[PDB]
């Protein structure tokens, strides 16, 4: 085993969705911009822009739905903000991987969200 160190700048995003949609709200576009302004100032970097959904379903139907809002939030920042298609990788975890309590309403709000985030060296 061997020590190690590092120091990176990080942008981390998550956009909420309603329920059953894939619509990117209007209110989520500038914090999708604020992950577009940092790969455009390093142009080495890209990201995998992650979709989750909540547990309300089939699992076979939200892995469709999560995969839906991960290329949405692709589209905002390729199409909308002019980052390189293949810099952003989109890609969906169904419901397999919550972050909240699907038994309350507030608990799979949270869960209908994508991740994504870029790091680069400091
Ligand atoms: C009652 C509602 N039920 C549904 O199962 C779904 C979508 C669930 C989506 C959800 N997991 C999310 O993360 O948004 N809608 C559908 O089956 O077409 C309904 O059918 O009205
Ligand atoms: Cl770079």
Same mark, same amino acid.
Do not use: W
């Given at each position: 085993?061997?020590?190690? #160190?590092?120091?990176?700048?990080? #942008? ?36 995998? #822009? ?5 547990? #309300? ?66």
């Amino acid at each position: 085993s061997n020590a190690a #160190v590092a120091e990176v700048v990080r #942008v981390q995003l998550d956009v909420k969705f309603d329920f059953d949609k894939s619509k990117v709200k209007e209110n989520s576009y500038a914090d999708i911009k604020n992950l577009a302004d940092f790969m455009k100032q390093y142009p080495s970097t890209s990201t995998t #822009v992650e979709g989750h959904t909540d547990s #309300v379903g089939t699992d076979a139907y939200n892995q469709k739905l999560s995969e839906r809002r991960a290329n949405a939030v692709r589209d905002v920042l390729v199409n909308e903000y002019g980052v390189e298609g293949g810099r952003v990788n989109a890609v969906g975890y169904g419901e397999s991987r919550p972050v909240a309590d699907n038994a309350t309403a507030e608990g799979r709000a949270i869960n209908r969200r994508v991740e994504a985030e870029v790091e680069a060296e400091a």
